[PDB]
Design a binder for these strands. Sequence first.
DNA 1: GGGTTTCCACTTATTCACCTTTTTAG
DNA 2: CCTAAAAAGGTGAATAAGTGGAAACC
Length: 293
Amino acid sequence: ESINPWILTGFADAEGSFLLRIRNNNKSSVGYSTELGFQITLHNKDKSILENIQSTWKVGVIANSGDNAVSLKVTRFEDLKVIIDHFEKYPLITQKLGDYKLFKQAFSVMENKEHLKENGIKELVRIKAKLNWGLTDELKKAFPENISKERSLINKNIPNFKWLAGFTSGEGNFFVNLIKSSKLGVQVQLRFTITQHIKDKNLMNSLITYLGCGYITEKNKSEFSWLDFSVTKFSDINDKIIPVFQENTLIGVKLEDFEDWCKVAKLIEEKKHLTESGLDEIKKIKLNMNKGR
DNA sequence: GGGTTTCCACTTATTCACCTTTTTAG
DNA sequence: CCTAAAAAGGTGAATAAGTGGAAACC
Ligand SMILES: [Ca+2]
Ligand SMILES: [Ca+2]
């Protein structure tokens, strides 16, 4: 099929990226050439998602990104109009909305060909200073007279379950937890999570009310921090999580892990997880999920 | 035809996904 | 006692984000 547009924006909120290149250049009149676009890089196993997007928007080029990943890149200027038309109708809701807004300001600058005149590049740099990781060291030297306005924090709520399915297609984990505990000796526990940096803590907190279950767990690694929304109560997983993605279909290989997750759920609901044979079946499903596929 | 646009190969750091065991709740 | 639910603990890598070089093109 071709990707539902709210799924697509949810996936883009999770995996997308806007780019603005401002390249030192001797062959350009202004001394710099530019390139603007939107891009997605995934593991090779989900090349299909990217092809589905390419054919859904009917723009963008696909290339390998190393030997284990592949990317969809859209920088052909005329084709950016399809990106904008899509994100005006179906807007992002994470902080990435801020990066989209800058992409859009840079689009105007180039639509008027202002990116050739010296003043035109000065505005692209001003814009670029607050996009993603901002200006390179080399760029701050070329333009130390730059002062750019502070960037508003985005705070937007989940628009609907389609957005959620696309976002969960990016950030979610459907997990079968096997706990030592032993007379049978293995408690089967389903876990659902969604992972996201603290910068979108508001959206992450809203998930408890949006889905009617779960809890936020704060996580750390070196100096970095982020958040998990987690559900571990079987009834909530069986009555609240599973129907949402049944009605609102995941994409990529992660749909297969969801489908296996649902097989284990059916077995827990039938108490087969408390029998030896059912336990064995669950181990086999777990074996071939996620990293084991 | 040559200044600019587009494309394609390729790289890098950390926010994701995914994993295990222990402890507490019921 | 027994089973479920949550907490405690951990990290490899698929992401986000970016770069070099050059052919395609107006
Ligand atoms: Ca993300
Ligand atoms: Ca993902």
